[PDB]
Design a protein around this ligand. Structure first.
Ligand SMILES: NC1=N[C@@H]([C@H](N)C(=O)O)CCN1
Length: 483
């Protein structure tokens, strides 16, 4: 009957202890806390972008203007509004002003190919009003009278794992509030802190930096694109900007480790890197704490976008030098289960598919089919029927120090990741094959491309950036005669 039916008491007890995660957080809802910070700290810097710094007063003023504009053009609460994700100031007033309108923002990269932007507008139900006009130069205005309704939708963020099947994750306020409380409390975020935003706003780790900043009075510091590509300049930039909290995907951090081994760094202001996405190992994290002088602790996380950025966490020990780092214990009010093909809860030590429950779950996808294939109800213990999200990820429950912990084990469809983004090998093969003049193409991750045909690698470069996002156009494009 139940998913734990076959377990012995000791094995069922391990799972019960692991998911003993309930925590009640105080204060009003998320947006209200953001407004209280604007009242308490109007003169503090709230966002530091590439074209300037905005105080909390200016940020909420500009956001107010955005929300009044949206009301003036018939955008009622519960609508979805696109915002141009850039590294400038404008997008922050856009996304905040959308939220004050009682709406949800869908982040769009304006450099992305137009065909993919059109899909996202259509699938999100999103108006492009704020893509067509400059959100920061809208006429000043008070915010409109939007009542507070509980668990409103905050964002639709797109995950592009399946080719021709981008999925729009719909995320509501309780999940984002719960995440924000965790980030602030777990990492001791304070008004004087400076939170780096490495992820663009199209990638949900930006969420984990922006709202904990704005819910505390800390400063959100967006990491400029030219700085992120150069691991050396990035390390210098973290010191010059006195960043206290940073987000990275595992592969990006490995680059920083390489750049740190070549030129060891002092980062006295850094207290936290929240890092995750791919499996990594204690011999790497030991190497890091060797060439980096810093109080920064590494917080390894795991989580799909479908469960509000992060679902598990592990404080990474700097003494250990061997073995795989575990993804750790669930975030507050999260609950995770390792299930087999049959839906039975795996004994400790046995690899299963992660299903996620609790306060972090999306409402679902915009697509009904995708929602029905991934969210489901299961009675996992006697008397506990969970709404679950089926991740596609494998993990086992292990003993790590005094605690039960999950250890990541792979995927069921094991696709590759590039700069933290799940992508299929077969989409970049079809994209270069579809360039008229090119023929066969093989793409390997070393992202390198070998293709047959007489399109010089410059004209191919130009045709690919018009078709693919900037992160899927291969780093090398080598013309070859046969495969
Ligand atoms: N915080 C964090 N979470 C995950 C992310 N939500 C994802 O789906 O890739 C990996 C990178 N960083």
């Amino acid at each position: 009957v139940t998913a734990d039916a076959a377990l012995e008491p000791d094995e069922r007890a391990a799972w019960l202890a692991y998911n003993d995660t309930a925590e009640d957080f105080p204060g009003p809802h998320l947006l209200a806390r953001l407004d209280a910070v604007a009242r308490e700290h109007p003169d503090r810097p709230a966002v530091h972008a590439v074209d300037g710094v905005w105080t909390y007063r200016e940020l909420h003023r500009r956001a107010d203007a955005v929300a009044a504009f949206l009301a003036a053009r018939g955008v009622r609460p519960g609508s979805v509004v696109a915002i141009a994700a850039t590294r400038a100031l404008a997008p922050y007033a856009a996304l905040l002003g959308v939220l004050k309108a009682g709406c949800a923002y869908v982040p769009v990269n304006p450099d992305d190919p137009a065909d993919r932007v059109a899909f996202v507008l259509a699938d999100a139900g999103a108006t492009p009003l704020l893509l067509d006009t400059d959100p920061a130069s809208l006429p000043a205005a008070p915010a409109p009278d939007v009542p507070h309704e509980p668990d409103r939708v905050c964002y639709v963020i797109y995950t592009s794992g399946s080719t021709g099947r981008p999925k729009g994750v719909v995320m509501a306020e309780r999940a984002v509030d719960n995440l924000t409380h965790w980030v602030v409390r777990r990492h001791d975020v304070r008004p004087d802190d400076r939170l780096g935003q490495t992820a663009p706003l199209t990638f949900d780790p930006s969420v984990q930096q922006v709202f904990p900043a704005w819910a505390t009075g800390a400063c959100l510091v967006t990491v400029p694109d030219d700085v992120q590509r150069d691991p050396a300049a990035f390390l210098d930039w973290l010191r010059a900007e006195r960043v206290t909290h940073l987000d990275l995907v595992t592969s990006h951090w490995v680059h920083l480790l390489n750049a740190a081994e070549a030129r060891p760094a002092e980062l006295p202001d850094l207290r936290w890197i929240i890092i995750g996405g791919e499996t990594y190992y204690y011999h790497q994290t030991h190497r890091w704490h060797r060439v980096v002088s810093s109080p920064a602790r590494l917080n390894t996380i795991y989580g799909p976008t479908e469960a509000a950025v992060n679902a598990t966490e592990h404080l990474t020990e700097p003494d250990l030098d061997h073995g795989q780092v575990p993804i750790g214990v669930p975030l507050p009010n999260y609950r995770l289960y390792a299930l087999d093909d049959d839906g039975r809860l795996c004994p400790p030590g046995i690899t299963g598919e992660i299903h996620i429950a609790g306060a972090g779950l999306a409402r679902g996808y915009r697509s009904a089919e995708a929602t029905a294939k991934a969210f489901h109800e299961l009675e996992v213990h006697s008397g506990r029927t969970e709404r679950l999200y089926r991740t596609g990820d494998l993990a086992r429950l292990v003993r790590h120090a005094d605690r039960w912990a999950l250890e990541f084990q792979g995927r069921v469809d094991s696709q590759v990741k590039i700069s933290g983004y799940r992508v299929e090998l077969e989409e970049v093969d079809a994209a270069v094959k579809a360039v008229p003049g090119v023929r066969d193409a093989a793409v390997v991750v070393r992202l390198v491309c070998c293709y047959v045909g007489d399109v010089p690698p410059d004209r191919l470069r130009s045709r690919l950036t018009e078709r693919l996002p900037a992160y899927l156009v291969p780093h090398l494009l080598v013309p070859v005669e046969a495969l």
